[PDB]
Each structure stands twice: as structure tokens, then as C-alpha cells.
């Protein structure tokens, strides 16, 4: 069928920027609520640490009303053509790390479609609101895309946070480490 080459060759983070060394280069449709996003290191005031890929360094902070950003992936530049998409259909994996500090509570959110050519939604994962553990812990939000059938061109990822407390700053989820792939 294989195949299983093509896909093993292409497999990388679609996902520009994921954790915020371009600041917010590569996110479009950024909704900048209260005092907007900002990039902090990691470990984060009140946060704890980040055990996991020691190469991610920084996370964007959100703050007292939702802040959201996205990121459009055009399958079809990343090298995947129409026919394995509307053929083999491979799997479209997508992971989000998201916490909360410790001295405030915050919400975290995402919803992440597969779109057609005309922006048609052919797929979607979402989890709505999500309350961010209190304890400060880190999480992984993990959804596989298969069996979605013909027509995906795009993947368009979207995720927020805000805080509980509705405080002049960033005390809302923060979230990084994001990722989109095409397994194999
Ligand atoms: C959106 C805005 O203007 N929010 C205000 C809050 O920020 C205030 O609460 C205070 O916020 C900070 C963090 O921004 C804390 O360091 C501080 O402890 C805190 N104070 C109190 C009493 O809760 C707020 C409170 O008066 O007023 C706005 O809600």
C-alpha cells in the first residue's frame, strides 16, 4: 500500500510557534481579552515546572477575560496530497499542554476542526470549558483524527484560557507545547 514511507518521511510539528520563541508570529484570529496573551518563561510565577521536552522554555499566558489564538494548516504546503488525504485518510493527531498557577484558578479551552478546500468542517474535536487543576499540574490534551473521510485540506487549531478571578495581569491557564501532526 506503503506509504507508510511517505508519511514517515513528511512527519514533523505542523504547528508553527508552539510555544512562543516567535511571540505570537504564526497565530492568526488572536483574541487579546483583558490584557491579552502574553509569553513568559518557564517555570512560570506560582507555576511548576515543565518535565517533559527540557526544550520547551516559554508558554503564552492568558489573562481575565478569553484570550484565544489559532492556526490554520494547509495540508496540502505541508506535503500531503488530495489523494493519500481523501485516500488513506491518515491520522491527524493533535496534542495541547495547558496549567494554571497556583494562587488563582483559570479555564482552558480548545476545539480543533479538519476543514475541506472551502472551509467546509468535516471533523471536529472539542472539549469546551475546562477547569485548569488548581494544584498547578500540568496537562495533556491528546485527540486522533481517523476514519474522517474525503475532502480534509486544512487542520485549524484553536485554543484559550482566562483566569478564574477576573485580575488585572496574567493569571489565566497557560498553555504550550502544542502539536499537530500526520502519523503514519
Ligand atoms: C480586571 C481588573 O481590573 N480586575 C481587578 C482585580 O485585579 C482586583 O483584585 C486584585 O487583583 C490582584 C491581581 O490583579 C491581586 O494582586 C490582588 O490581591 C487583588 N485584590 C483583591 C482584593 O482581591 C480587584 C479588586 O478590588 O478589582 C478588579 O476586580
Known amino acids: 500500500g506503503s506509504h507508510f514511507y511517505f508519511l514517515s518521511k513528511r512527519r514533523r510539528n505542523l ?3 508552539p510555544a512562543g520563541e516567535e511571540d505570537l508570529e504564526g497565530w492568526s484570529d488572536v483574541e487579546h481579552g483583558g490584557d ?10 506560582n507555576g511548576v515546572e ?8 516559554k508558554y503564552f499566558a492568558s489573562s481575565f477575560e478569553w484570550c484565544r489564538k489559532a492556526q490554520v494548516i494547509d495540508l ?11 485516500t488513506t485518510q491518515p491520522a491527524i493527531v493533535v496534542k495541547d499542554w495547558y496549567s494554571g498557577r ?22 471536529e474535536f472539542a472539549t469546551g ?4 487543576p488548581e494544584d498547578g499540574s500540568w496537562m ?14 486544512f487542520v485549524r487549531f484553536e485554543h484559550g ?12 491557564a497557560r498553555v504550550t507545547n502544542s502539536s499537530v501532526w500526520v502519523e503514519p
Open 15 to 17: 504547528l508553527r510557534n
Open 36 to 45: 491579552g496573551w502574553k509569553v513568559e518563561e518557564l517555570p512560570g510565577d
Open 50 to 57: 515543565f518535565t517533559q521536552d527540557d526544550s520547551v522554555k
Open 76 to 86: 496540502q504546503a505541508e506535503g500531503y496530497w488530495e489523494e493519500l488525504l481523501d
Open 102 to 123: 497556583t494562587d488563582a484558578g483559570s479555564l482552558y479551552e480548545l476545539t480543533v476542526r479538519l476543514l475541506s478546500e472551502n472551509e467546509d468542517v468535516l471533523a
Open 129 to 132: 470549558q475546562v477547569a485548569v
Open 140 to 153: 495533556e490534551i491528546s485527540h486522533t483524527f481517523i476514519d474522517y473521510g474525503p475532502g480534509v485540506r
Open 161 to 172: 484560557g482566562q483566569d478564574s478571578v477576573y485580575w488585572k495581569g496574567w493569571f489565566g
